[PDB]
Symmetry: D2
Subunit: 431 residues, 4 copies
C-alpha cells in the first residue's frame, strides 16, 4: 500500500494548475457580462478551445483508444485542480467525458474508432453528452411496474424512432442548439409509446442507447428536435443542460450502441459509476477553494482583535473539520478509482465503492464550504470573496450525477442487500 | 403555561400574509431588472411606501411611544409571515426597527419624541439604521487590550466629532446616499483618535452612541461623510448596507443618545439582544418557505415512479427533520421574546436565552433549506423553484446580526461562566 | 402565549426534587449489591413503596378518575426532576402510568372504577404494564399482508384464550413473576393461530386489548403463563420487562377492554402517543444531569491550566450545544402535552406533534450526554462520575417507547402523507 | 498510488484473526466472574501470555531493534482485527507498545538494548507503560505560565528523585502493583517542587523522561511508590490504569532517557503522534463489530414484517452511514501511518496528519455504533447482543490517548497556525 505520486502524476497536477491559473481565471471577465445561461455557456467556448489545445479533451479518452488518459488517479488530480479555480469550462470537459463513456466502455473497436475520432484530434471544440435525465425525473427509471423512462424508442425499417423529452444533460444541445457532436440518448424500448410500460417485464431489459450526432439532427425535420428551454441554475451558471423534445426523431440502426437490454443498461450503469467516483474530485476542488480562502484569511486577519482569528478555538475547530472532510474525501476518491481499475474485483464491489464515494464526498463538501463561511464571518457573504460562488456551486454536487437520496443510496442499498455482499472485498479481498 | 393565540395575534398574522401576498410578490418584477445592489434597493422603495401605509413601520414602535407594536410575539408572527414570502422590503422594515431600538430603549422622553416622530407618522419612507459594524470586524469590539472600535468620537466644545468607517449597517445611507432619517452611530470615545485604546480600561466604559440624521449630514462638509462602496451580497440582494467613511464629522451634543460608558454599551447590547431573538423569526420564515415548497412537491410528484415521493422513507426523513427544526425554532423564538418581556428576570437570564435562540434558529434554518433541496432533488437547483433564492438568503442568518461563532456564542459563554449563572431561571424561576 | 408556572406547578417541582434527593438517592446502595436484573428490580420495591406514600402513583391518574394528576405539564415537570437524579423506581412509576393509560382513556366509568382502584388508594406497591412488544418485533404490527402480532386471542364460550409471547413490557411480571396488578395485553384476534394473518384484512380491525390481573393468572394452569427470561439491559438496569409466554391463557369476557378493532387499536395508539410526548421529559432529565455535572466541572476545574475549562471556546461550544438541546427539548415537550390536552384539535395534529417530540428529544439527549463527556474529558469515563450511567441510560430513549426509526418516524410520515395534513394546525389553527 | 496488500500483510491479518477467534473469545468466561477492575485485568493474564507466545508483543518492536514489526500498515491491520473481536488483552498489547515507544524512538542503542530485552524474548508476560497522565489533567501540561506537570523530578547526587502522582496510564503497576516491567515516567524538572513553575520558562524545556522498572521500585522504600486506587471504567473493563503516588522515589541517572528539555518533549510528542494514528485502527475494529452485527441482523430479521429490515430505506441509510464512516476511517489511518513512515516529510506534516486521524476516526466510530444500534432497534439494548459492550468501549476513543477537545485539536490548531503550514504536503509534496 502506497500513496506516492509518480513524476507523470505530479506533471499532470502542474499542467492542470497552470491551465486553470493562466486560462480559466480569464473566463469570468467574459461570461459575467452575459444575461442568460446559454449566452454564458457560449462565452466559455474560447476556454474550451484552449482546453482542447492543451490536450484536456484528448486526456478524457484511454490511451488504447487513441487518447492520452494515463489513469483515473491522474484524472482525479486534474479535476481537483480545475474545480479549485473555476468550474466554467471544467464542467464542459467532464460532461464530454461522461458523454464519451458509453462508447469508451462498449466492446466494439469499429464503433469506437468512428465516434471518438473528433475527441482525440486536438482540434475544434467538440462536445459530448450522455442524455439520461428527464423532466419527470429518473430515480425510478428501473422500477418494475413503474412508468419507466418517458423517452422511448421503436424500430421502424432500418431506423429507430425516438419520442420523448430530456432535461439536464450537459452539452446536449451543443454550442448552438443544433446538437452536441455526440449524444448518447438513453431510451426505453416501446412499440406503442401511448401504452404504459409492461408491469411484468424487468425495466432493465428494455433499455436502448441511441447515438445522435449533428448529422443525425440535420437529417431530421426541424420540429423533430426542439430545445424548449434552458434551466437557470443556482451555480455552474455557465453550463448548458437544456430541455429537449424528440418528436418522431429518426436514427439509423448503425447508431444503436449495442443490443437493447441488460447490456445497454450495464453500459449506462458503468458510465455513471465511473462518474460517481470522479465527481468527488469536483466536490473536493470546490470545497478546497473554500477551505484555503478561509485558512489564509484566518491566518492574516484579527477581525479588530489582537490575534489572528485562527487562534480562536471555535474558528480553528471549523478549519479543522474542513481539513478532515477534504482529506477523507480525497483518499476515498483515490481508493474508489483504483478499485474501479482493478480487474480482479466483481462489479458489485466496484459499484458499492463508487456509491459511497459519491454520497460522502458530495454531502461533506457542502458542510466544508458552510463551515469555512462561518469561520470567515460576515465578509464571506459578499462577492469580493469566493464564497457566494462556492456555496452555490457546491450545492450542485449532492443533487447531480444521480442525487444521493433517490439514486446513489438506493443503488448502494441494493448491493448491501445481496446475499453475497462482501463489505470489505475492495480492501481485504474476496472469499 | 399557554400557547394559544389571541384574536389580535391571529389578525396580525392575517394582515402580514395579505400584505406579503398582495404587495411583496410584486417586488421581484421591479428589482430583478436592476444591475447593482443599490439600484435593487431603490426599486424596492414603492414597497416600503406600502409597508408604511399598512402601518408596519408604526408597528415597530411601542404604543407608549406613539406606535402600534402590541407585543414581541405579534412581531415574531409578522416577521415569520413576511420572510416566508419575500425578504425584500421585509429586511428594510426590520433594519429600521433595529435602528430605532436604541432610541426606544433609552429613557429620555424628549429624545424619543423628537427622533421617533417620522416613524410613527404613517407618511413617507423614513429609514433608520444602527451603525455598529466596521470594515475591520466587531467580534472583538469589547476585548480588553484590543484596538476596539475604529470609529471614534471626541468632544470639541458643544460638539462631538466622528472619525472612522462603518460597513454593513442596513439602510445607513438612506435611499439616495444622503443618509438614513435616523442613524445611531456607535463610537469609541477617544480624545486622541490616533492613540491606541488604553489597554488598562474596560472597553465597555468607552462606548458612545451619536444620533445622526439627514440634517446632521447636510450641516457637514460633503467630504465629512463619504459612501465608499456597496457590497454585492449572495442573497438579500435588494438590501443596502454601505461602506461609510466619517472624516471629522460634527454632531451636536444634544444628539448624544446617553452618557458614554456602560450605559451606551448596555443600550447597544439590549438592542442586539432583541434583534438576536427576532432574527429567529426571519430564519423560520425562509426555512418554512423551503419546507412547504418541498412538502407540496413530495406530495404531488412521483419522480417517474409509481408513488408520490413522500412515501420513500429517506424523503420523509428529510421533511421530518425540516419540520422538527422549524417547530423547535418557533417555540424557542416565542420563549425568548416572552423572556425578554418579563420585568421579573435579570438581564443576564434574558441575554442568554436570546443568544441560544439566535444560534439555534439560524444554524438549523440552513440545514432545513438544504435538506428540503436534497428531498426535492435536481429540480431544486433551478430558478423556476424558490430554493436557489432561499439557499442564498438562509446563509445570511448565521453570519449576520452578530455572527454565531465570533459574537453570540462568546456572549453566551460569558454568561455561563459567571458565578451566579442559573441555567434554568427563565423556566423554573430565579 | 405564556410560559409562566403556577404555584401548583412550582410545588410539584419542589415535591418531585425533595423525593428524588431524600428518597431516590438511597436506591443505589440497595440495588448495586444485586446480581441480575430481577434482583435489582426487587431491591427497588421499598423505593416504589415511598413513591406510593408520596402520592406519585396517584399522580399518574386524572382527577376526574379519582387520581391527583393536575395536568400533563405538571407531569412533565415531575418526570424531568425524577430522571435528573435517578431513573430507578422513576421508570417503574412511568411504566405503571403507561399500563394504566388504556383504562384511563377508555370511555367506561364502571371499568375505570374497578381497575384503577388500587392505583389510587395510596397503598401497597401496585404495578401496571402495557404489554405490546414481542420477541419478533412490533414496528410492522399494522402492516397489511404481514404476519401481524404473534400474540393472538380467540373467543371460546364467554372467555378469551391468549396464545403467544411478549417481550420488553416494563413491570409485566410484577414483583414476583406472578404478574403485574394490571396488565393490558394487546393481541391480534385469530380463530386459528396456526393460520397466518389474512393478507386481505386491515390489521387495525383485528386488535383486541385484554386485561389480565394476578387473579386471572392464578385462575389459569401454571404452564399457561411462563416467564422465560429477563433481559440484562445496558442501562436502566433496575427495571424488569421480561419475556412472557401465554399458552391457552384464559381471560374472562368482562376483562376485554372494549370492542375489538379500530377502537382497540385507537386506545393503544393514543396511549403510546401520550407516552411519546412524556418520554421527552425523561430524556431531558437524564441529559440535564449530564449537562449540569459537566457545567459545574467546567466552572471549577482548570485541568492543570491557569483557567477554569469553561473559558476555552471548544469546551464552551459543547456546553452551549447541550444547553440549546435541553431548552428546545423542554419547549417541545410542553407544547406537545398542551397540544394533546387541546379538545379543539384533530387527532392527527396531536399525533404528529407527539411523534416529532419523541424523535427530537430522544435523539438530541444522546448527543447532549456525549458532548458533556467530551467537554469533561477522560474523567467522564470512570464510575466516580455519573456519565457512565448517564451514557447507558440515555441510549435507551431513541430505541424505547416505539423506536424512532421503525415506529415514530413512520407514524409521523403517514400523517404528513395525508391529503388534509396541516403542518401548523397546532400553532396557527385549522383552515377547516 | 496503490492499495493492494502484500502476502505478508494478508498473513498478518489471518494470524491476528486466528488469534482473536481461538484465544481472545475465551477471555470473557474468565474475566466476567471478577468483581473489580484489577481482578478483571489479572484474569486476562493467561491471554496476554498466549499473545506473547503468538509473537504479538515482539511484533510491537521494529525489526532493527530485535522485534518483528514489519510496518505500521501491518500493525493497523492487526489492531483492527483484534479490536473487532475483543479489546480485553488487545488493549494491554497496545499499551505496552506505547510504553516502549519512547525507548524505540531515542537515539541510544545501549538504553534500547537494555530495556527492550524482555519484550523481544517471546517469554513471560512483560508490560510497558508510558506514564504521562495525571489526576489534575494534562491538556495544559505545556501551557506557559501554567502549573505544568504535577509529577516533578530533581537531581540529588547521582540520582533523580520523583515527586508526584500519575493517573490512567495503562499497565503502569504491572499485574501485581509492584510495577510495569518498563515505565517511562514523564516529569517536569523542578529543583524545589514547592515552588510554582516559572511563568517565564517555556515548559517544553523542562520535560524529563525517567525509565522505571520493577527493580527501581524494589530498590525504593515501599511508601515511595503507592497505588492509591484503580478507576472503574465504563468500558474496557479489564484494563488497569491506576492512580499512583511517587514520594521521594529514587532513580539512577542511567535511567534518564535523554537530555531534559525539547528532546524529551520531542520523544513524548512523537510517541503520542504514532499512537494517535494507530488508535484509529482500534476505533475501527470496535465500530466494525457494531456495523457487521447490525448488517447481519438487518439481512436476516424482518422484525415481524414481510421483508428483511435492510429493505427499509431508513435502516439502509444508517448502515450506509456506518460503512462510509468505517471506510473513510481505515483509509485515513493507512494514509497517516504511511505519512509517519515517510522519511522525506517534515515532522509537523506527520503530526498534523496524525491529529486529523485521531480526531476523525474516534468521533465517527461513536456515531457508527449508535447508528448501528438504532438500525437494529430495541434488541441492541440487551447484553445478548454486543452493542451494550461496544457502546461503552467506543466512547473511550474520543476521550483517551489525548482527548480530541483539549489535546488533539489544539495540537492540530498550533500546526495550522504556523507561518509555513502546508496543508497538502503529505499528498502533493512540499514546496
Ligand atoms: C450541472 C448539471 C450537470 C448534469 N449532467 C447530466 C448529464 O450529463 N446527463 C444527464 O442525464 N443528467 C445530468 N444532470 C442531471 C443529474 O444527473 C441529476 O442527478 C439527475 O437528473 C437525477 O436527479 P435526482 O437524483 O434528483 O432524481 P429525481 O428523479 O429528479 O428525484 C428527485 C428526488 O426525489 C426523491 N426520490 C425519487 N425517487 C426516490 C426513491 N426511489 N427513493 C428515495 N427517494 C426518491 C429523492 O429525494 C430525489 O432527490 C446534470 C444536472 C446538472 C445541474
Ligand atoms: C443584510 C445584512 C444586514 C446587516 N445589518 C446590520 C445592521 O443593521 N447594523 C450593523 O451594525 N451591522 C449589520 N450587519 C452586519 C452583521 O451584524 C454582522 O454580524 C457584523 O458585521 C459582525 O460580523 P461577524 O460576526 O462575522 O464578526 P467579525 O468581526 O466580522 O468576525 C468574523 C469571524 O471571525 C471569527 N472571530 C472573530 N473574533 C472572534 C473571537 N473573539 N472568537 C471566536 N471567533 C472570532 C468568527 O469566526 C467570526 O465569524 C448586516 C449584515 C448584512 C449582510
Ligand atoms: C483505557 C485507558 C488507557 C489510557 N492510556 C494511557 C496511557 O497509556 N498513558 C497515559 O499517560 N495516559 C493514558 N490514558 C489517559 C488518556 O490519554 C487521556 O486522554 C489523558 O488523560 C488526557 O485526558 P484529556 O484529553 O481528557 O485531558 P484533561 O487534562 O483531563 O482535560 C479534560 C477536558 O478539559 C478540557 N480542556 C482542558 N484544557 C483545554 C484547552 N486548553 N483547550 C480546550 N479544552 C481544554 C477538554 O474538554 C478536555 O477534554 C488512558 C486512559 C484510559 C481510559
Ligand atoms: C426500559 C424499557 C421499557 C419498555 N417499556 C415497554 C412497555 O412498557 N410496553 C411495551 O410493550 N414495550 C416496552 N418496551 C419496548 C419498547 O417500547 C420498544 O420500542 C418496542 O419493543 C419497539 O421496538 P423497535 O422500535 O426497536 O421495533 P422493532 O420491531 O424491534 O424494529 C427494530 C428496528 O428495525 C427497523 N425497522 C423495522 N421495521 C421497520 C419499518 N417498517 N420501517 C423502517 N425501519 C424498520 C428499525 O430500525 C427498528 O429500530 C420497553 C423497552 C425498554 C428497554
Ligand atoms: C463527471 C460528471 C459529468 C457532469 C455532470 C454529470 N451528471 O450530472 O450526471
Ligand atoms: C432584526 C434584524 C435587523 C437586520 C439585520 C441587522 N444585523 O445584521 O445586524
Ligand atoms: C411513559 C413511559 C413508559 C416506560 C417505557 C414504555 N416503553 O418503552 O414503551
Ligand atoms: C496505542 C495505545 C493506546 C492505549 C492507551 C492510549 N492512551 O490513552 O494513551
Amino acid at each position: 500500500v502506497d500513496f506516492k505520486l509518480s513524476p507523470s502524476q505530479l506533471e499532470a497536477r502542474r499542467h492542470a494548475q497552470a491551465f486553470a491559473n493562466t486560462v480559466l481565471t480569464k473566463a469570468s471577465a467574459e461570461y459575467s457580462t452575459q444575461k442568460d445561461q446559454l449566452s454564458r455557456f457560449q462565452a466559455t467556448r474560447p476556454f474550451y478551445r484552449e482546453a482542447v489545445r492543451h490536450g484536456l479533451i484528448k486526456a478524457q479518452v484511454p490511451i488504447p483508444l487513441g487518447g492520452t488518459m494515463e489513469s483515473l488517479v491522474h484524472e482525479s488530480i486534474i479535476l481537483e485542480e480545475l474545480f479549485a479555480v473555476e468550474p466554467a469550462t471544467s464542467i464542459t470537459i467532464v460532461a464530454t467525458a461522461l458523454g464519451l463513456m458509453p462508447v469508451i466502455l462498449c466492446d466494439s473497436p469499429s464503433l469506437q474508432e468512428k465516434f471518438l475520432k473528433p475527441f482525440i484530434s486536438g482540434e475544434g471544440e467538440p462536445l459530448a453528452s450522455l442524455m439520461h435525465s428527464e423532466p419527470n425525473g429518473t430515480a425510478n427509471w428501473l422500477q418494475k411496474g413503474g412508468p419507466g423512462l418517458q423517452t422511448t424508442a421503436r424500430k421502424v425499417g432500418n431506423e429507430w424512432v425516438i419520442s420523448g423529452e430530456k432535461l439536464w444533460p450537459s452539452n446536449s444541445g451543443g454550442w448552438d442548439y443544433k446538437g452536441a457532436d455526440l449524444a448518447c440518448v438513453v431510451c426505453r424500448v416501446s412499440d406503442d409509446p401511448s401504452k404504459p410500460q409492461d408491469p411484468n417485464v424487468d425495466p432493465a431489459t428494455q433499455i436502448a442507447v441511441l447515438l445522435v450526432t449533428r448529422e443525425t439532427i440535420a437529417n431530421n425535420k426541424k420540429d423533430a428536435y426542439q430545445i424548449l428551454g434552458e434551466p437557470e441554475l443556482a451555480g455552474h451558471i455557465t453550463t448548458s443542460g437544456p430541455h429537449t423534445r424528440f418528436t418522431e426523431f429518426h436514427v439509423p440502426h448503425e447508431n444503436l450502441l449495442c443490443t437493447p437490454g441488460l447490456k445497454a443498461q450495464g453500459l449506462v450503469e458503468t458510465a455513471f459509476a465511473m462518474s460517481a467516483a470522479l465527481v468527488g474530485a469536483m466536490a473536493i476542488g470546490t470545497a478546497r477553494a473554500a477551505f484555503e480562502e478561509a485558512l489564509v484569511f484566518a491566518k492574516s486577519d484579527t477581525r479588530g482583535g489582537s490575534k489572528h482569528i485562527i487562534e480562536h478555538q471555535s474558528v480553528a475547530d471549523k478549519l479543522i473539520d474542513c481539513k478532515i472532510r477534504l482529506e477523507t474525501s480525497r483518499l476515498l476518491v483515490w481508493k474508489a478509482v483504483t478499485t474501479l481499475e482493478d480487474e480482479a474485483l466483481e462489479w458489485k464491489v466496484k459499484l458499492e465503492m463508487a456509491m459511497q464515494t459519491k454520497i460522502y464526498t458530495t454531502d461533506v463538501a457542502v458542510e466544508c464550504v458552510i463551515d469555512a463561511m462561518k469561520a470567515v464571518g460576515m465578509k464571506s457573504y459578499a462577492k469580493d470573496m469566493s464564497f457566494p460562488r462556492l456555496l452555490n456551486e457546491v450545492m450542485c454536487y449532492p443533487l447531480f450525477n444521480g442525487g444521493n437520496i433517490g439514486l446513489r443510496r438506493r443503488q448502494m442499498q441494493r448491493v448491501m442487500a445481496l446475499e453475497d455482499y462482501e463489505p470489505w472485498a475492495a480492501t481485504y479481498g474476496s472469499s
